[PDB]
């Protein structure tokens, strides 16, 4: 249990989860600044009624929101390339301890693979995976037509984190490979704007189409 | 010949009820140990008489839970399948099986034209 107790005592000096305090980590694009909660907290879990708050979700920590997306991602109407994604075997649903442990291994992997503060790379991935324009249907005289529309920043965060989680499910499903390694790949590929990542590719798809529907 | 648990049919006749039950599976032996009903017991009296010839009557029965023993080997008993007493002759291989499995009550179910 010595790794367990080491990670227990290291954040005694208020460090997010175990290590990697939030002070060294910055924000690049000016739009995500008032919506990413980078405040120093030992655990990313408040059990808060931020849903009741029309915009109180901005106060929840980014890793907490990432787990909030990761734990509800299985079984839905989306069939990307004709696959059914679902957690048949010990679903993460209601098992936020499982999600905690898995994304804990995810932080460890990003440490041992990039050697930098994981929160900084997460900032990079979210900043580079946010689509910036979309399509909307407007009808006038019965004349439906498509329109290019700008996106709100908070929705850009929501969609970026959802791409991260949906990518983790997508690669981890139906493979010998395991969930944490996949989440690490999605994050690292988005953080360097790797188009092979589903997050950046679908950011590009959403930005396009809307690009042409003007 | 015929055998049941390493004993020939004569070896089954001479054995007593206790060990004859011992050589049966759990269900039939447990039913024997827990006893028989008096309708069952009097039917056994009738079949004992028929085996000895005193009971000349065509033997009929309704007890679908009667476990057939070696002593019933070699007679024709008629069991009530639901309308009438369908006949069955008891063979040496018949031992250890309820009579009720041998009266076809549910009939054959085949398929006509769908409507």
């Amino acid at each position: 249990a010595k790794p367990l107790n080491e990670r227990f005592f290291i954040p005694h000096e208020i460090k997010v989860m175990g290590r990697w305090s939030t002070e060294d980590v910055e924000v690049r694009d000016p739009s995500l600044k008032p919506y990413i909660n980078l405040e120093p907290r030992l655990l990313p879990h408040t059990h808060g009624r931020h849903a009741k708050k029309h915009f109180g979700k901005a106060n929840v920590h980014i890793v907490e929101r990432l787990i909030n997306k990761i734990m509800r991602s299985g079984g839905s109407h989306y069939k990307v390339a004709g696959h059914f994604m679902r957690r048949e075997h010990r679903s993460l649903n209601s098992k936020k301890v499982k999600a905690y442990e898995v994304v804990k291994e995810a932080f460890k992997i990003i440490e041992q693979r990039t050697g930098k503060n994981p929160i900084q790379v997460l900032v990079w991935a979210i900043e580079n995976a946010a689509p910036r324009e979309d399509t909307t249907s407007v009808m006038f005289g019965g004349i439906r037509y498509h329109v290019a529309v700008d996106i709100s920043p908070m929705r850009r965060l929501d969609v970026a984190l959802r791409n991260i989680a949906l990518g983790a499910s997508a690669k981890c499903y139906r493979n010998k490979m395991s969930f944490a390694e996949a989440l690490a790949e999605e994050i690292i590929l988005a953080a360097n704007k790797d188009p092979k990542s589903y997050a950046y590719s679908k950011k590009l798809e959403i930005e396009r189409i809307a690009e042409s529907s003007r | 010949e015929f055998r049941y648990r390493g004993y020939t049919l004569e070896q089954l006749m001479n054995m007593s009820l206790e060990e004859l039950a011992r050589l049966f599976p759990a269900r039939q032996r447990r039913s024997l140990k827990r006893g028989l009903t008096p309708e069952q017991k009097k039917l056994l009296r009738k079949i004992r008489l028929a085996k000895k010839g005193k009971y000349k009557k065509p033997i009929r029965t309704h007890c679908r839970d009667m476990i057939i023993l070696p002593e019933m080997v070699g007679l024709t008993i008629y069991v009530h399948n639901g309308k009438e007493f369908v006949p069955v002759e008891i063979k040496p291989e018949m031992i250890g099986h309820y009579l009720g499995e041998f009266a076809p009550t549910r009939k054959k179910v085949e398929h006509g034209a769908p409507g």
């Binding site: 249990a1 107790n5 990670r7 227990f8 005592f9 954040p11 005694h12 208020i14 030992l42 059990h47 | -």
Partner: protein, 128 residues
């Protein structure tokens, strides 16, 4: 000083006195409880209080009811209240509020009953 803590069903009863720093959960040391996340939650108020008061007082807390997460959160409530009552310091209270609004308030949430029409999966669960 005696202090109380309530979270859902778990109940934490804490007694704080002078001592070396021996903090015990149901009589067990806080550092050995196998769930690491629950260990984080239990240690948060005494992480934020300070090593000085951590070593100065002795707190014995007994937690009963709920799950381990409820027990840990109730214990966190109990340590927070015990520390603030023992010190009687306003600045620690304000830091606790800034860290989270529940440290002296708590969670007034409770479970809803299971209404009919397939009550099994939860309150708001119905048939197809």
């Amino acid at each position: 000083i005696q202090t109380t803590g309530k979270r859902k069903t778990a109940i934490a009863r804490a007694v704080i006195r002078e001592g070396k720093g021996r903090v015990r959960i149901n009589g067990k040391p806080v550092e050995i409880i196998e769930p690491e996340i629950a260990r984080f939650t239990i240690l948060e108020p005494l992480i934020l209080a300070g090593e000085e008061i951590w070593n100065s007082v002795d707190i014995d807390v007994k937690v009963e009811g709920g799950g381990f997460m409820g027990q840990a959160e109730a214990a966190r409530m109990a340590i927070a209240r015990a520390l603030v009552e023992w010190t009687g310091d306003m600045s620690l209270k304000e830091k606790f509020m800034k860290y989270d609004r529940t440290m002296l308030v708590g969670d007034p949430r409770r479970t809803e009953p299971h209404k009919p029409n397939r009550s099994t999966k939860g309150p708001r669960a119905k048939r197809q």
